[PDB]
Design a protein around this motif. Structure first.
Motif, short mmCIF file in Angstrom:
data_model
loop_
_atom_site.label_atom_id
_atom_site.label_comp_id
_atom_site.label_asym_id
_atom_site.label_seq_id
_atom_site.Cartn_x
_atom_site.Cartn_y
_atom_site.Cartn_z
N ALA A 170 34.26 31.86 46.66
CA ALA A 170 34.67 31.29 45.61
C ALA A 170 35.99 30.52 45.78
O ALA A 170 36.56 30.91 46.94
CB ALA A 170 34.96 32.25 44.49
N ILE A 171 36.37 29.42 44.92
CA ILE A 171 37.54 28.66 45.33
C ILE A 171 38.43 28.85 44.01
O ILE A 171 37.71 28.62 42.79
CB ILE A 171 37.42 27.15 45.62
CG1 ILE A 171 36.74 27.09 46.78
CG2 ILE A 171 38.65 26.62 45.55
CD1 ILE A 171 36.71 25.81 47.47
N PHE A 172 39.71 29.21 43.99
CA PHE A 172 40.53 29.49 42.63
C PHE A 172 41.16 28.14 42.49
O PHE A 172 42.06 27.88 43.23
CB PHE A 172 41.30 30.72 42.70
CG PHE A 172 40.62 31.73 42.98
CD1 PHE A 172 39.88 32.70 41.76
CD2 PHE A 172 40.58 32.52 44.10
CE1 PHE A 172 39.37 33.93 42.01
CE2 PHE A 172 40.03 33.91 44.30
CZ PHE A 172 39.24 34.59 43.29
N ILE A 173 40.84 27.56 41.36
CA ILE A 173 41.69 26.66 40.59
C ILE A 173 42.30 26.79 39.18
O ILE A 173 41.48 26.79 38.28
CB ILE A 173 41.03 25.17 40.73
CG1 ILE A 173 40.30 24.97 41.97
CG2 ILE A 173 41.92 23.90 40.31
CD1 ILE A 173 41.47 24.86 43.14
N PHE A 174 43.43 27.67 39.10
CA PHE A 174 43.87 28.09 38.03
C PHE A 174 45.02 27.30 37.24
O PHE A 174 45.88 26.68 38.10
CB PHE A 174 44.13 29.56 38.29
CG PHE A 174 44.97 30.20 36.78
CD1 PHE A 174 44.24 30.18 35.78
CD2 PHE A 174 46.33 30.43 36.98
CE1 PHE A 174 44.81 31.06 34.68
CE2 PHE A 174 46.79 31.16 35.67
CZ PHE A 174 46.04 31.23 34.63
N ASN A 175 44.68 27.18 36.09
CA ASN A 175 45.92 26.35 35.00
C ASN A 175 46.77 27.41 34.34
O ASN A 175 46.12 27.64 33.28
CB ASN A 175 45.15 25.17 34.47
CG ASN A 175 46.05 24.25 34.04
OD1 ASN A 175 47.36 24.44 34.06
ND2 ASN A 175 45.76 22.93 33.57
#
Lengths: 195, 341, 49, 153, 48, 71, 97, 48, 146
Positions: free
Chosen positions: B103-108
């Motif tokens: 998985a790849i985490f792109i958190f805002n």
RNA sequence: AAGGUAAGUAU
């Protein structure tokens, strides 16, 4: 200490005189695993080395004018040839003409050419800047953006480094080995500390 | 004889069998790694303002952590779980290995959106450099997502959890010079998101790569600010990473407390979240004390904040302890002993 | 310090005072002596010490 | 340089995700027909570091059309046109199913060299109107323009 | 001679004494304003 | 107020990078009118940054309040 | 003013400095023009050629503002000329003088 | 330093002219009779 | 007594040599590639082409009818406890840093770091104490697990 | 011949 380029910690001095470097200042030693090995620059018992003179690396005015005429004639021919092909001149086409001509050929590739075309009477302005700015301009006679940089000094620096014995010969006079830096490659200076 | 100005060493005198062969590399190693010699080297370097390490860029540390809570858009890119494998220890002493989807985490942290890019195991087939490929894929996905979003949703800062991904993001965002990517000295618990069942089962069950959008602030912005939501979420993630099993039990104090199918976190009232956060903080502090053999009572507020965040209070090495003694003047030196020579 | 000044170079002397503050010369000598002591202690039987 | 003048007078990509009581919101992503446009402003600070980084992409992640385009354009900006030409030729060689790399090679290649590049492109990627129109523009002769458009049709 | 493509005269160039004095005065001004000036700045002014 | 003054007078990445000069990388002269002047690590190899640093808008030039009133 | 003057050729080529050459280049061109004159180095029949170099002494300090303005009306608008000439009629300050 | 015709060069004693910001460089070209007449005219007003 | 032959290191002449080498390599690549690139009636009339196109249109109308051996794990074999499984992830390394990829568990590394910190807070074949500075518990996977 | 003194506190 005087004529080393500022990048290596020297003063970056330019010389217009005959200054001899004693052969006793061209020797350095480094410690290897087996032992300590001594090195010298300018072997075969040559005469005392000389720092390069600034005159040898400045092209005279007459030859430079001849070169400018030839180079601009060549550029006119190349431009006319490219018009016949509806092609724009590339940087590789004007490669042998680089750093030649008055104005310099590299001024054609400047990013300010469109706005500098409206700069008229700039040479009289540069000469008249003495009455507005307190500092004295030693290049009152030319503008770097318009005429280009009519002098190149990298060859002079290369010859100065070669005469001084290179990095090994220069850095022996310094406190470089006292820093125990593994190599001089990845280093950089800091012209002012945080304090 | 030691030349301190040139780091040259030598020895002259008599020798007994084996003294010289030993003392050669003895002196070599002493010169290479002496503490006091290191102090001299560092003092000379500091006086000369000569540096070797790559110039230091702004880093998300425990000091500028407060600056993170602004009104600008920030993203948290984590590539820890891109190439992910699972190993099991059999009772026979053999251990087995089975790679799983990543998985790849792109958190805002402002809106709570979590763009999850599932990385199927098919991409690792016939690839010599797993880490480089993983980082480049992560950077490509980040660029694809930032191109997908409109300009007003584009981030003004992309904080990277791992040092190695700074270069791929730096070179893969050449079209966005006005977007600053930062490293983080403190290790945020964004790798513990997949410990949640709703993410782990989804990623394992996935068969092809796909972009998935989540929301870690499910029902939080309706009652608290995004500054409080981010801190609560980071506390929850830290507790999950530190002790997954106990944190799950804490998150459900009673069987009555339930989670909606579209909300990752339990639906607790505003007052209940205070007690839940206190319990999670107690979990984190107690487990830190257990792992470090320290008492939670003596920890100061700054130390507690560093423990909760990813800031690492690493014990100085034996070499570093000796350097500090040499670098500093003797503490309250007492000349209580007289020696005649 | 074991540094000999061949002339009054205060620009250099001031910066040499900082480098060898807190008795750095003595500490370096002591550390080297101690390290050699451990080196020779580790080789007591082999060197017949 | 502009021929009027006289002596005195990008790491793109392909995938965009579609941003539209469910916890899962998959975003179907679409492909990009064009790998951006040649409008790089030379925003590279460390030229050698960027050269090294882009080289790793071409190795670790091959068959990525932006990777070869970005490296070729970085070489072009620094003034090494021939290195850029060789890089884009290699990219066309090992990424031959994408129009963008072929039309970037046609842009970089000078004169009659671009004609053979376009011929190889249409040989490997036929039925591509973008390559055929570029060939028509590249070919100056009107009769040869008609011949190229005829072969396209 | 441009028309005949032949050499007819020789200009013997020489630096005017006024420019000599100007350069010497510039060096004197550089040296005088060097009580607090660093070595790098002095050498930079010299080089310029 | 103190935060704004710190932001203004504080060192900037464009100025932090211009204060760094590479060791042994003999650059080329970029200003005829003043030698020794250099950009340092700005737009030069060895800076370690692929992308160029952006201009800090907090250092933008602004005019005085009384001068603005006169204008 | 300089752009317009160059556009409509206000200043003849003998006005120096010229944007197209550094002073060494115009010295070289001056020497070549001397060499390229017809029979410049002939003295058989007693013909002599003389080089005169001088300055307009106190050129700037002796410029009358009224005459300068009236001469500027001939090349620029009366409003521009009046602005330029009135600009030279200003108070000059140095400390308390 | 150019003329439309060679005959236009000889129409006047002044053959070349160049004004710097304030310096003027003027190159005449006399015949024997012209120089003699000019010298006589000068000595009429300022005898030596 | 007599210094041994030493080649003068010129940092900026070496750059010129590198640039010349790069230019020569680019020219050689161009010369080699032009050989692989330079190998490549109806052209003058249109009615014949349209006839051919119609014939081809008629022709088209007629034709219409798992294994991870060698991956190092930077953990001791005894660190892994029987009865449960646990996840490994790649350790962070620079892209340009050419090194073998190692498999890492975040929790195991946290445990090892805590153990090291505890040891260093209580500790207060030649020259062992400084051997760690100049210069590790990993095992190589074979056919999957080991 | 100089422009090359550390300022001390103790004994």
């Amino acid at each position: 200490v005087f004529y080393t380029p500022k990048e290596l910690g020297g003063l970056g001095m330019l010389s217009m005189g005959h200054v001899l470097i004693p052969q006793s200042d061209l020797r350095w030693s480094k410690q290897t695993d087996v032992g300590i090995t001594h090195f010298r620059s300018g072997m075969s018992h040559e005469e005392d080395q000389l720092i390069p003179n600034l005159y040898r690396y400045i092209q005279p005015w007459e030859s430079e004018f001849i070169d400018s005429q030839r180079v601009w004639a060549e550029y006119a021919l190349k431009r006319q040839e490219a018009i016949a092909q509806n092609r724009r001149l590339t940087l590789e086409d004007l490669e042998d003409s680089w750093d030649r001509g008055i104005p310099r050929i590299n001024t054609l590739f400047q990013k300010d050419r469109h706005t500098l075309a409206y700069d008229k009477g700039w040479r009289v302005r540069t000469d008249f800047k003495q009455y507005q700015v307190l500092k004295q301009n030693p290049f009152w006679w030319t503008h770097q953006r318009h005429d280009g940089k009519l002098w190149n000094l990298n060859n002079y620096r290369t010859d100065m480094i070669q005469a001084l014995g290179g990095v090994e010969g220069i850095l022996e006079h310094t406190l470089f080995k006292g820093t125990y830096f593994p190599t001089w490659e990845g280093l950089f200076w800091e012209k002012a500390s945080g304090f | 004889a030691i030349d301190l100005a040139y780091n040259l060493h030598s020895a002259y005198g008599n020798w007994f069998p084996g003294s010289k062969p030993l003392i050669q590399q003895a002196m070599a190693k002493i010169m290479k790694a002496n503490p006091a010699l290191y102090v001299l080297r560092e003092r000379i370097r500091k006086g000369l303002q000569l540096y070797s390490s790559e110039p230091t860029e702004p880093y998300l540390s425990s000091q500028n952590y407060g600056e993170l809570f602004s009104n600008q858009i920030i993203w948290f890119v984590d590539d820890t779980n891109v190439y992910r494998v699972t190993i099991h220890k059999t009772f026979e002493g053999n251990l087995t290995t089975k790679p799983i989807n990543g998985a790849i985490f792109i958190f805002n942290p402002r809106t709570g959106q979590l763009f999850l890019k599932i990385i199927h195991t098919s991409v690792w087939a016939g690839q010599k450099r797993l880490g480089q490929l993983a980082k480049w894929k992560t950077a490509e996905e980040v660029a694809a997502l930032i191109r997908s979003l409109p300009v007003e949703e584009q981030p003004k800062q992309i904080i990277v959890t791992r040092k190695g991904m700074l270069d791929p993001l730096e070179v893969h965002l050449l079209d966005f010079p006005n977007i600053v990517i930062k490293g983080s000295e403190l290790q945020l618990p964004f790798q513990a998101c997949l410990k949640v069942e709703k993410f782990g089962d989804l990623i394992l069950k996935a068969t092809e790569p796909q972009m998935v959008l989540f929301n870690l602030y499910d029902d939080w912005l309706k009652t608290i600010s995004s500054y409080t939501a981010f801190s609560r979420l980071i506390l929850i993630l830290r507790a999950l990473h530190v002790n997954n099993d106990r944190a799950k039990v804490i998150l459900k104090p009673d069987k009555t407390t339930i989670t909606e199918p579209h909300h990752i976190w339990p639906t607790l009232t505003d007052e209940e979240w205070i007690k839940v956060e206190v319990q999670l903080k107690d979990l984190i502090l107690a487990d830190y004390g257990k792992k470090n053999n320290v008492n939670v009572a003596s920890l100061t507020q700054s130390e507690i904040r560093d423990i909760i965040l990813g800031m690492e209070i690493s014990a100085p090495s034996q070499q570093r302890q000796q350097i500090a003694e040499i670098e500093k003047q003797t503490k309250e030196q007492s000349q209580l002993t007289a020696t005649q020579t | 310090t074991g540094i000999f000044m061949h002339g009054k170079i205060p620009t250099l002397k001031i910066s040499l005072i900082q480098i060898f503050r807190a008795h750095l010369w003595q500490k370096i000598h002591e550390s080297i002596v101690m390290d050699l002591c451990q080196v020779f202690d580790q080789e007591l039987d082999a060197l017949e010490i | 340089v502009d021929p009027r003048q006289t002596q005195f007078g990008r790491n793109t990509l392909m995938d965009m995700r579609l941003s539209q009581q469910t916890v899962v919101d998959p975003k179907g992503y679409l492909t990009d027909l064009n790998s951006m446009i040649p409008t790089h402003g030379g925003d590279i600070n460390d030229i050698k570091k960027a050269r090294l980084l882009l080289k790793s992409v071409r190795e670790t992640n091959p068959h990525h059309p932006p990777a070869w385009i970005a490296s070729a354009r970085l070489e072009e900006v620094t003034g090494k046109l021939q290195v850029a030409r060789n890089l884009i030729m290699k990219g066309t060689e090992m990424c031959p199913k994408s129009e963008d790399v072929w039309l970037e090679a046609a842009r970089l290649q000078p004169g009659d060299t671009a004609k053979a590049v376009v011929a190889q492109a249409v040989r490997h990627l036929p039925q591509s109107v973008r390559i055929y129109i570029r060939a028509a523009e590249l070919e100056t002769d009107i009769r040869a323009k008609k011949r190229v458009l005829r072969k396209a049709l | 001679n441009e028309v005949t493509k032949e050499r007819t005269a020789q200009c013997f160039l020489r630096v005017d004494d006024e420019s000599m004095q100007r350069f010497h005065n510039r060096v004197r001004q550089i040296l005088m304003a060097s009580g607090s000036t660093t070595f790098t700045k002095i050498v930079n002014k010299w080089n310029t | 107020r103190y935060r704004k003054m710190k932001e203004r007078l504080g060192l900037t990445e464009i100025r932090k990078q211009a204060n760094r000069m590479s060791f042994g990388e003999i650059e080329e002269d970029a200003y005829q009118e003043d030698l020794g002047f250099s950009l340092g690590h700005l737009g030069k190899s060895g800076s370690g940054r692929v992308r160029q640093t952006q201009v800090n808008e907090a250092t933008k030039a602004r005019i005085s309040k009384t001068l603005q009133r006169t204008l | 003013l300089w752009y317009e003057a160059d556009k409509r050729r206000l200043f003849p080529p003998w006005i120096k400095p010229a944007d197209t050459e550094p002073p060494p280049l115009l010295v070289y061109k001056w020497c070549q023009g001397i060499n390229n004159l017809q029979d410049v180095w002939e003295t058989s029949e007693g013909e002599c050629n003389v080089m005169l170099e001088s300055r307009f002494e106190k050129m700037y300090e002796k410029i009358d503002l009224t005459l300068l303005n009236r001469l500027l009306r001939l090349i620029v608008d009366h409003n521009i000329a009046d602005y330029m000439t009135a600009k030279n009629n200003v108070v000059i300050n140095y400390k308390d003088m | 330093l150019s003329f439309q015709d060679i005959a236009t060069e000889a129409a006047h004693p002044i053959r070349l002219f160049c004004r710097y910001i304030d310096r003027i460089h003027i190159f005449f070209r006399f015949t024997a009779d012209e120089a003699r007449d000019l010298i006589q005219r000068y000595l009429t007003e300022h005898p030596d | 007594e007599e210094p041994v032959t030493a080649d003068v290191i010129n940092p900026m002449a070496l750059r010129q040599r590198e640039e010349l080498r790069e230019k020569l390599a680019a020219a050689k690549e161009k010369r080699l590639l032009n050989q692989k690139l330079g190998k490549i009636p109806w052209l003058d009339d249109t009615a014949a082409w349209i006839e051919r196109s119609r014939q081809l249109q008629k022709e088209k109308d007629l034709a219409e009818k798992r294994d991870l051996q060698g991956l190092t794990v930077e953990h001791a074999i005894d660190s892994f406890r029987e009865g449960e499984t646990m996840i490994l992830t790649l350790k962070d390394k620079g892209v340009l840093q050419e090194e073998e990829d190692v498999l890492v568990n975040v929790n195991l590394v946290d445990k090892e770091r805590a153990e090291k910190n505890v040891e260093l807070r209580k500790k207060k074949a030649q020259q062992k104490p400084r051997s760690i500075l100049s210069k590790p518990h990993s095992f190589r996977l074979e056919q999957g697990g080991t």
